Amino acid sequence: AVKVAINGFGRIGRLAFRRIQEVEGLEVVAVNDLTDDDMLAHLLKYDTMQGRFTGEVEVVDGGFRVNGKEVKSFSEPDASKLPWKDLNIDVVLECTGFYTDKDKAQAHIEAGAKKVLISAPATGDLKTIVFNTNHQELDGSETVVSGASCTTNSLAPVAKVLNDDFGLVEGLMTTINAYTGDQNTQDAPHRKGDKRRARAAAENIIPNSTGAAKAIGKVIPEIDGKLDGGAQRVPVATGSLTELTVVLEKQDVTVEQVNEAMKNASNESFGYTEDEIVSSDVVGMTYGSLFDATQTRVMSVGDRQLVKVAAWYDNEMSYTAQLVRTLAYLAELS
Amino acid sequence: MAVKVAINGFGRIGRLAFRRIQEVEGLEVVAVNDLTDDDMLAHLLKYDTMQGRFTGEVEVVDGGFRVNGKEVKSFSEPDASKLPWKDLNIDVVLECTGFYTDKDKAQAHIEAGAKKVLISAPATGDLKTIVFNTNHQELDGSETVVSGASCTTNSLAPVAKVLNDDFGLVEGLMTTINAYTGDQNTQDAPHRKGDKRRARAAAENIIPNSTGAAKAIGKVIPEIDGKLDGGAQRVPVATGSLTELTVVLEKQDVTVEQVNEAMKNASNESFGYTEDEIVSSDVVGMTYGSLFDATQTRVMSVGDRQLVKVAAWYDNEMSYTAQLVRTLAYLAELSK
């Protein structure tokens, strides 16, 4: 099996570990974080939104034992010091939020890992990959790769159908987002100077920036510059919805045509549903994006139309399932 | 003398309307009707989860409750036409039950003796739909049954009016991000109206749902009839809401700055303006019908083709209630 190390055993690190248990060909041999084994084992076993871990977890000498398998743990904040060469690490899943750039994540390679897959958008000379939208741009020789964001993974399959079938002129996005760990429990100073992420995450509708639409061109070059938008973070602990309002080249577009084109593009990353679901129904799903045909709207005034659509994602598990798909493909290629 | 008001439905809107009326001279709530008893009516006025403790003294007496010494008569009658409005010389009934959102049905109050009825919601039939400081001057005194429009309508109207007047509205789509309300279930359970989404645990979900606010904007602003549509996303905050509007405009080369300044230029007691990075809890209890947020203004340009996007905050409770009460005073002032 391909030997995987997880840097940052956080929400995405822990869910990625869970997901790897169920993909033949991949094995997590080491995790790194900023805490002790008592805490790491505990957070794997118990999960507020994603539920109890299936098998058994026991703290052992150099880390913890998950269903018979030993996993080594470390507490090394500076990634260049990690014993990656000695552990023969093939790929590092970079999930800390502190190495979101090609040169920063290069620290893992210096430590002896063959490749790095980052669990967020990242700056620098690197590929940004949404599985089943643009993973075929990987060739196996890449050393540092981005897995895009949760919002990008929800958006890209949708935007791609809109453009291929109808011709995208322009569009604006609003993502209605579960609150995340970069927000405060109570109003307090925010480390990044963000006066809105400073506010009590679970008591507020909180506007915030995102680059998912603005930077879509990294994933779909032919629509680069044609989208923008933002986020509204709201008090659900996981599960999100991307709403996209577009102008198209095709004229007299109907709801039926838009829904049908989306259904026709469905696969393991891109879901399709006509059920009147709500956000808790997407908790733990493995679709990168779940297109919801019940929310499609076409506004027509004379010859001029706006098309609006919406796709659900579990910002946690949807993204994680996409990340682990891209992980296996990157390993496959080499 | 003071305009004599009766509140039908001492719920969220009715109780807040009562509180707001204590702050406004010339209006007096003389009577309250609901489906409960005085112990409960008094308690719910005294204590309010989102809107805070009531400022005054509340005391249960025979026939109702005393508020700062002033007697309020209470009744527990579901059939509006049975109410003693003649004897109490009612001038306007604030209709906040959710069960009389129609011209003919609301006529029950007039039969019972009231002069006028103001309905706390959109309403069917041959009546005017009013957002204070957008189209309240369309009222001419002849009206006996009026709609105060919806919370979402009151947030949207002044925004849409500026967009159209200054830039020419071609078309647009709205999404409103809404506090959950009493027509939703606490736990996943069958829903009275067969709505499979309002059926779900209100404070645990992002819940899509319909709204007539954009579709029916033509009733408040005729010149844009049919040019807006949209929907809601109901989320787990107990009050406070945000309206996002994405539009196509006639004027070309529009900028963020131009839109913001135009919004600011139209500000008043109903239509507020802010450049502060506020969140939903900051508008709880505010008395603006709509609070434009200049920080959320965006412009997408691809060649000569633009989308323009704006957002205005509203406390679906106090924003709407403050507007409802301005319309009430105006509508009663026309009778004199």
Added chain:
Amino acid sequence: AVKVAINGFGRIGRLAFRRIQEVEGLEVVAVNDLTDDDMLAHLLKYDTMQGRFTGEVEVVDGGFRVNGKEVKSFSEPDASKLPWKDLNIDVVLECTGFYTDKDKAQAHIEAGAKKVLISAPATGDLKTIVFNTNHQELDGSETVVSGASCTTNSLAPVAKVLNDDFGLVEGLMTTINAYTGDQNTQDAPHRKGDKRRARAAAENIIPNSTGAAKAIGKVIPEIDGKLDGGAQRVPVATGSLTELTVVLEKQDVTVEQVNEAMKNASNESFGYTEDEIVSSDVVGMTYGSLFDATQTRVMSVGDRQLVKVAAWYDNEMSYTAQLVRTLAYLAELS
């Protein structure tokens, strides 16, 4: 298989349905509520806290199809008008909350059902059963039985051990409960005139009465009149905790003896944990009561002691698993 009808397809009724899916010898042939089949099917499929229905559901003619089997559905508020005679109903699971009385529940018997199991405490001379505490008091000649409350199923096995091993003098219970459907979404008149249940469920700590401790005599006669207490309903949508503070006859009681006696009494209804869990970790669990050893406390001043303990329960699934165990045992008899 035993033919079951479910009256009230609500939180308990739907979860009992799910649970009944994995019990050979038990079959739901009919459901009754006050809504249409579309609503019923949808709420079976999708569940906010309990997750997606594991099988698959389809609306048909006079009810719905759940994995090959057909379930008849009705919309009859008056139970006496139900076709229980025609459908040969062996047991009605009474989950509406409107028939919590021996004589009231008799309507199902007149309608042609053989037995009624009520999913709550109920008045009149009938047996109140907590599975694995007193289900052997059933002899199979009973026509109407109560499955007790959620709190009673959490409290009974705890209380039994305390009395058996230490002798109960007297105690007070406080349960910290998930909010439930008898509460309002927003501050509003309450149907039962309760000025606390009238308040916004998910935005408050709400004190409220409970008859679980006061009526513990129905399940464990030897401690009748020895317990009382109340509830504090808080904003978690399911998952609850019972705390009990007692005076005991035995002297010099220690935390360790208490915990050891609980672990010794453990079974499939009464679990034991030394993990530092929180409420979301018991969501979906199948124990009626999970004793939490980390929460045991002993106060001593001279020879005088207060002993305190706590046990988790998913007021939803914990109760439901217990109700379905009682259903199967009750049905096995005549």
Added chain:
Amino acid sequence: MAVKVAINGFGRIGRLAFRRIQEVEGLEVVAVNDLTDDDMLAHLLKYDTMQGRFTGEVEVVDGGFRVNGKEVKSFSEPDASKLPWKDLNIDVVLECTGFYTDKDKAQAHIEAGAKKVLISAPATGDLKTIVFNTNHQELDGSETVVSGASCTTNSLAPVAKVLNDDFGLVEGLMTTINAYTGDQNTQDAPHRKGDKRRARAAAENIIPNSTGAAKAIGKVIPEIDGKLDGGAQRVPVATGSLTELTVVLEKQDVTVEQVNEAMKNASNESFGYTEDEIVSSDVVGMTYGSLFDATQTRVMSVGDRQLVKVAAWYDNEMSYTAQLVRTLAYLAELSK
């Protein structure tokens, strides 16, 4: 003439302390220290999710920020000993960071040049722990570092005292059901202090946790040292909490009426009394250190053997803060 206060840690307690001090004559906040900039400090003072908007004018100026024509200097210095307290003539530091909850560590402020330190939390080392209107009279003017106790301790002490004074306290156990606080994570994550329970999503769980409030009550009421213990359940409300106390007493044949009356007679500006069926949102912003709720009094009698339960509300924020600022003024007033 004004006493010069510096607040170290402009957090939940630090900010509300600032607000409170605006009602106390002869007390002025001249300086604030934290880990951020004036943009952020000014914004968090203006807008408050649970306690509501600050009404005064706040603007960012060169040395810090200006509040209603009064200047406050701000710093961004994590090391208390490096603060310019001597230059600023600081009389008392209100230590609200959570990082100096120890006599010797808090000494850094004195070395920095502050005359006194009042810590907004329980604190280790050789110092007094003070609940205003329970034991503030213990202060004799020569204290250099003082603890203002915990929120729970302030809710508990006036209750424990009445019970002992009027009934003779044998022993008791406590559960406090608490609003979640900033020492908890928004989502399940490693916890900085290794606490596997505070590690969990604060707003989605009932979370058991320790509290020294009952166990360390002897520092406040010496005559009941060692007679109380208990813990906490942290639940998803953002502020507002309740202390439940179950006790055995020496006085026999005790009634709910005797207990409630004893509590009422003891009531003052620190210890409130209610017979209303309130919930947690009703105490948000209250200024009682403790609000006794007579509706929750219970007496369990089996033969001649009794258990007595009582319950007192507190806003863990404003109740505690109001108590801290009372102890602040009294401490400042000593030696004058």
